[PDB]
């Protein structure tokens, strides 16, 4: 499958991602991409801030859908 | 006094603030207790857009009125 997750600057990096894959679960994958403690980062997807442990389905996220999602701190 | 924001998670959350304080100043509290820069922020009340260097009370804001948030995504 695939999502996009864009950050601050625009710079818009790919995820493999899991359908009902946690949101927990996301921000390893960002942090096994790109370095950066899943306690930092705060993800947001259509102007809603997602928990972890939320489903992206259960947020109705589908391939080729946008997380911006983005960033944290 | 204290006042009520709308966040994007949609869990209202409160602030400590004063009559006049800036809008900048709102943003900062907000960073201090959601770790979202300011730069990132824009807020709204009774429908307009607040903009920072205006007060709360240039804007008419009282005792547990609430804010609603979002995301500026500029990029
Ligand atoms: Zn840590
Ligand atoms: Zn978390
Ligand atoms: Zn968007
Ligand atoms: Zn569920
Ligand atoms: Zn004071
Ligand atoms: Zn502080
Ligand atoms: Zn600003
Ligand atoms: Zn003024």
């Not at 991602?17 to 946690?22: A, I, M, N, Q, Y």
């Amino acid at each position: 499958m695939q999502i996009f997750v864009x950050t601050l600057t625009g710079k818009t990096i790919t995820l493999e991602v899991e359908p009902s894959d946690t949101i927990e679960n996301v921000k390893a994958k960002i942090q096994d991409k790109e370095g950066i403690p899943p306690d930092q980062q705060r993800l947001i997807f259509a102007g809603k801030q997602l928990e972890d442990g939320r489903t992206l389905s259960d947020y109705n996220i589908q391939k080729e859908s946008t997380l911006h999602l983005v960033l944290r701190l």
